[PDB]
Ligand binder design. Structure first.
Ligand code: NAD
Ligand code: NAD
Ligand code: NW8
Lengths: 478, 482, 482, 478
């Protein structure tokens, strides 16, 4: 029975009610019910947050004058603060999303805590180049901060996807306007308290909760935001990018979805393959940017693979989020709950042996078989617990079949063969290629999509590129 | 000079436009028609992208190549450009009004240097090996992006194409290039050389034609993975939106600017004047980096103004090929009147016209060099990109004043600062919001040094190791050991 | 303050010297004995290296650690140093004669900052993935070197130990440290903190004792893989030779210098004087970076000379702990006479002694600040490293003159340049043969910025990403696919 | 029947006879006989070369004022020149060394040509850092050239080991004093003609042929050489480093020998293993820094491995160097020819089944078996064609056995297992670890020894570190 203390617009380290007066409700996907009502922001609110962020970015600001090292100190402060109150946040995260509490505690917030500390290390190590040119010339580059950055996040990993942006952005010295999902604003607002407590100057991070077409679009078009980062649907990603282009040509980072392939070679540890490929599709209830939507399996192990797959889905406990016995919780919205089983009869019309589940109970873990490429279950991403298992003959074959999507966020390969591992790794068009593991993410390893799965990267030194503008200084001597 | 090349370049073959239509390119000095080249359209673009896709398919000759052999191919191309250095330089002038010696020693030097710089980057495109857990091996590969599209302007037709082609090819991509309608000759000549140098067919394809027509088919193509566009801010906005609405292709942008040139009291005044001067009027004022806003400190304001006027008047104008010219015709009459329109806004808003102000010879597209006096921030000549021979000079009191006044624009491509004061030079360099900040020089570009815009002057960078990031896709391989 | 720690630190345990011998450390101001600590010898060193080898064996707790957890351990250590910040600062002063506020705000700030800087480098020590052939996967790993040895001087006992310990530990090495005989207290205190912070036993071991005895056993040890030595040029020569004659251990060297401080005519003269002044006399003149040769342009020579004399005389000297002191005792009497000997060479070779020249109070080891006048290149005070409070000021005509005259030494650790002229500052910075070149500042060290010697002033660098190269071994993995 | 045109000391692009007047003879290891007599340099000659090199390094020199890019132009010129006259050089190389002519042509000179072109690319891409520090400070690093560098080379790969130093050193803008081996000075002197022809300013590269204790020691102690690079014996490497330390503390790079292990896992392609492990020990007549001195093989394939090993040695053609039918030529000096078979009875006293060869004929390819760690054939490096084959049980086992040497230049592993490849790679203490190949060197991949096999690296961007001195510039503003 947790009290929600932060419900307002966070601007200049002060709590605000919407200039409109409107508010909206977030509810608990597990136990249909509100938790509470949140200030509903809109264009004028973001106009205020932006101005706050520009003033904090002005030359001579307490933010801009700081030591590079103190900038990372502050980020270490925040990670400290997030470690204290870690349970508070993990709890809010589950009330907002129906995630298992243990999942929020040991995944979502470990991720936040490592990501914050990692980029704290980077703040005084952001370095440009001194460039050789002519004898009488001194030419060098500066990696300056971009300015006001906007973060727009989904509901599946609200706080994590938020600190994946904030951490690099702040370590590089930018200021920010954050807009959480409507469905899950709570952890984001809590972080604002922590951001004030740890001592970030007012205006460095402001937060405007609200809806997409209102607040998010107010950000994506704002003429004095210099960059956006967005994690969300592919289609909304296109709009955000079009918005940016029409307005002020702000720099855009995008992390979207994908038809993420999982390739099982005949020589694979099959018990590791089935277990990871199971955790790959069904983890966080199948709602995950990294979700495995296409399990390719070689003939030699196909049929037995299908069997092992099915026994694993059977045994998986599902129930109330607070449960120390849970893996899978509730999906967050029946908007797509219908789309899922709508797409489960998809693969009975075209022919697929459903050896498992096939309907709601939450929803029963479902497993398909004898799936082919043309079928829709192997065509459009599911956003839910369904395992479409396909058959392949050749290495070259599955390479073209995996790459035949317009996306390419992740890919996972299972084999003990050195040449099979490496040739597949080189050949798959995916931003991350895991080998004999799944959902192995590290603050120090970059993450992002090829093709229509996104632009740019989060998580690694490559993250810093999205949050810096390269300046060339060229000096001629007499 | 007779124009050998006038066709669509696909798979190292020359093709008549699928429509059969053709369009003409004209000479801004002779005001006459050089020739007719094939006018491409969406079907032609579709034909080139399929070539470039097939050229980038795994196993193709182009992908199985060594890293170093790619580098060697760029060197062989740069060799050839050096050979036919005078042909290209000629074609460029005919179609630009560029002084032939400017094309030979600036444009084409830059081309051969860029090609050679990035030739050496090929076998040094390196990713990372990243520490993680005891039992995990984690590294990144910098894969090529795929089919890249280049859309270039007329101000520096060949140079702006190379700037893209060199790093793109060095990273192992394939290309679909559209030169400007006004200036297609250099691009298609290069295509001859691209074949001769040994590049596999399909690696580089070229479809001349118009922006609404071929450019739009390239920006929206669902199978082009990356677009690089130099040109207007407006068409730049449109290009990024098409890229967005379609398949989210990565976008590089090099647009214009209202580039400040700030002269402090303690400047070499004669250097400031000379560099600021050719900074304005170089390449007939038609340049990305054109000096648009000469801020001068009050101490030296007036006799800076005087000293510039004399440079302007004595500056040779005439036939491009004549060895003594420094400024030639404007590109087309569409521009010629547009600048003259803005000159008249300078008078109409009240700037003392210290020089020029008119057109030179009624028949031609030339303009005599023009200078203005006590220009302020609000006037037209001080906020709109003129892109002609016009030197609008302003006055400032304090360095903090001029900082805020230079950064008050929506642009930020280049900036110059003249002073001898170490703290001033560096304080200014830190705080001016511009992609390149020259200091006691102007137009000092190197293939090693990145170039590109802050704010609405661009996205990304061309020319330096930073250019490889625009032509590669980061991939993370992460292996867990048993 | 009572000294808690006086023993050999091996495997996180305290050990009496295998011989049983002990030696004493004395206070340069009180001229009294602080305490007795164990005098180590080869057997003790042999004991510590075996600990450090076992700590570095694959599978050991220390090697199975995460990269980030190593970083976290360095942060936990830096936390602890901040806690017992006044204890350490005290121990340092007692054993140094350092003004206690100098130790607190300079030494220990630098220590905590360095520890924290390199804590963040741990999970960002990255190798390369290298393009080669279509069928080959080629990458480099930056493995740790192994057991590293650190040998440090007395001028900055704790700081110079950390400078090595932070990057070495961050890269995952194990360590055998020998503090100077004169100044062992800070080092062994740290060892307490090293245990408390959670470092596995054996990762860091400390054997106090003498150079001919413990230092020599470390430099020659066949199982130490890397040696880092700050100290004299001569002992530096000997250390590298022992490293050579034995097992070719990698060698970092930070030695002394005859560091030029060049003041141009157009300098902030008051800044030049103040910074050049504390550049000489800081830390009682006993500093790697000590200003040894003040070149001044003739235009400002004489009343530069005057303006410095007044700073010298009004500079407080006295008890280290007294809050108003700036300069304390020299380290031992071995030095006290050595500087006084060279002062008398200044008179004997003819320099006008504008200030000081004597010793302050007969009982103590203090010296009043001393300044010389029309010093030339050939004199003793202008070619030998004084390492005390002595400001030898020279005169120069041209910048090219002073370039050749500053680079005429065998050293090149640091150099300062004061001017407001952009070209002068940069021309000088380019051409002075020194590891660090300050400009309108002095003693401006950052944990992010590399430090170390040109020529005979050192090998390698401490403090910046460049420091990781001294503590890692590059390995190339090259896989051919079938 | 080739004429040797260059026999003198090369200083300031001019040909010189030794100030002493002494000369020495190089002879042809294949056909006992001189080729000719070479100017024999000594201390005063190097004193002249050094001064030449310092003057060419002075500020304002045509060398120092050059564009970074033109510096690489020149290196491209030299590689061009070496490609022309490639046959001339390959020929001199074989007259000097007894290498097969085809081996000199397609290995030694391809290596030289690629190495030169690779570092030509690097000259205008040597970049320092702009370092974040305080707001009012500008701090950046310059990677300046070190100055006069000395290269000292052996006889096994005279020209290649020489351009492995010259190429990085010149691209970074240093000047050089080269001392080839006494046994093989000829290609080095030829390169001097090419260095003049291609347009390098006088004094940038000078060459002083001569003996080790005379000329090499004159370099290693010279008070105005700022760095040495040395490839040669371990013991001479120690002396050079001691010399450097006693004199002026010049920067030293060392490439020495090694007891280079070759590890065959049970799952290995055995035909690739035996063939590479055969080419690994017997190539260039067993005289090679990369020579395989220790072949560890897992029980599961040991005995059959030994068999296959022996049949390969049988069939290998050996004869006159000029032969289009050759693999192996003559060893260059009977100084160690005796040491080899001296060490072949080594392993009969301690017990080793000699299934192959065992004596001179050149010398017969020899193969040992049932070798153990203690035996001297598995203890000291051979410098000749002998294959000591050992047996191992475990992965952990062979890891400690491989690493139990004081050296660590290279190591080669054969397995199709992904986990076995990677764990071995991480665990072996060697500067290069090849997997399913041998002697796979690339101008772009760094090369060098762990432990007593050397300091520093040649060949890769890491090469540039040895040829640059980091300068920190730190500027405080008012
Ligand atoms: N109609 C279909 O066939 C279909 C299919 C799949 C998903 N969807 C919808 O996509 C939604 C995904 O929700 P999500 O939050 O996880 O991902 P998302 O990709 O839709 O948006 C995530 C974030 O961006 C915000 N946003 C929404 N519109 C915006 C806009 N114009 N400008 C700026 N920001 C905007 C949102 O407030 C949220 O914070 C689902 O809820 C579903 O209704 C529809
Ligand atoms: N006595 C033994 O047990 C034993 C064992 C193995 C090898 N060796 C000897 O080592 C030699 C290896 O010859 P190599 O040229 O291939 O390798 P090397 O490691 O001996 O020397 C190679 C290069 O360094 C030069 N050099 C020699 N002495 C020098 C010195 N003091 N200072 C500077 N340079 C010096 C040489 O002129 C040559 O150019 C063999 O010829 C052999 O006689 C002896
Ligand atoms: Cl948009 C624009 C185009 C060209 C110049 C320009 C002016 C004068 C000299 N140059 C040299 C180069 C150059 C370009 C790329 C590589 C190497 C050199 N470029 C220039 C200036 C602005």
């Amino acid at each position: 029975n947790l009290e929600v203390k932060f419900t307002k617009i966070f601007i200049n380290n002060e709590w605000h009610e919407s200039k409109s007066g409107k508010k909206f409700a977030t509810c608990n996907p597990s136990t249909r019910e509100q938790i509470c009502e949140v200030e509903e922001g809109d264009k004028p609110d973001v106009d205020k947050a932006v101005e706050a962020a520009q003033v904090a970015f002005q030359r001579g600001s307490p933010w801009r004058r700081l030591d590079a090292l103190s900038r990372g100190r502050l980020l270490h402060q925040l990670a400290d603060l997030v470690e204290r109150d870690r349970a508070t946040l993990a709890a809010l995260e589950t009330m907002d999303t129906g995630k298992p509490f243990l999942h929020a505690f040991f995944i979502d917030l470990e991720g936040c805590i490592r990501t914050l500390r990692y980029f704290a290390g980077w703040a005084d190590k952001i370095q440009g180049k001194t460039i050789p040119t002519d004898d009488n010339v001194v030419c060098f580059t500066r990696h300056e901060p971009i300015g006001v950055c906007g973060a727009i996040t989904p509901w599946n990993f609200p706080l994590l996807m938020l600190v994946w942006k904030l951490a690099p952005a702040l370590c590089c010295g930018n200021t920010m306007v954050l807009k959480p999902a409507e469905q899950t604003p709570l952890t984001a607002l809590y972080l604002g308290s922590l951001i004030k407590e740890a001592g970030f100057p007012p205006g460095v991070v402001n937060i405007v909760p609200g809806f997409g077409p209102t607040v998010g679009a107010a950000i994506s078009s704002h003429p004095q935001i210099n960059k956006i980062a967005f994690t969300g649907s592919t289609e909304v990603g296109k709009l955000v990018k079009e918005a940016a282009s029409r307005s002020n040509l702000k720099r855009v980072t995008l992390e979207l979805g994908g038809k993420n392939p999982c390739i099982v070679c005949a020589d694979a540890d099959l018990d590791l393959a089935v277990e990871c490929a199971h955790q790959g599709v069904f983890f966080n209830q199948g709602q995950c940017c990294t979700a495995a939507s296409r399990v390719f399996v070689e003939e030699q192990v196909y049929s037995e693979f299908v069997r092992r797959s099915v026994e694993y889905a059977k045994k998986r406990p599902v129930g109330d989020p607070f449960d120390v016995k849970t893996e899978q919780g509730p999906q967050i919205d029946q908007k797509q709950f219908d789309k899922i089983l709508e797409l489960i009869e998809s693969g009975k019309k075209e022919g697929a042996k459903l050896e498992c589940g096939g309907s709601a109970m939450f929803i029963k873990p479902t497993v398909f078989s004898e799936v082919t490429d043309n079928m829709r279950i192997a065509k459009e991403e599911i956003f839910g617990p369904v395992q479409p298992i396909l058959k392949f003959k050749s290495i070259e074959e599955v390479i073209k079949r995996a790459n035949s999507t317009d996306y390419g966020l992740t890919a996972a390969v299972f084999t003990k063969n050195l040449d099979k591992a490496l040739k597949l790794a080189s050949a798959l068009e995916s931003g991350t290629v895991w080998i004999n593991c799944y959902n192995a993410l590290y603050a120090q390893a970059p993450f992002g999509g090829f093709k229509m799965s996104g632009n740019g990267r989060e998580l690694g030194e490559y993250a810093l590129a999205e949050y810096t503008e390269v300046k060339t200084v060229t000096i001629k001597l007499g």
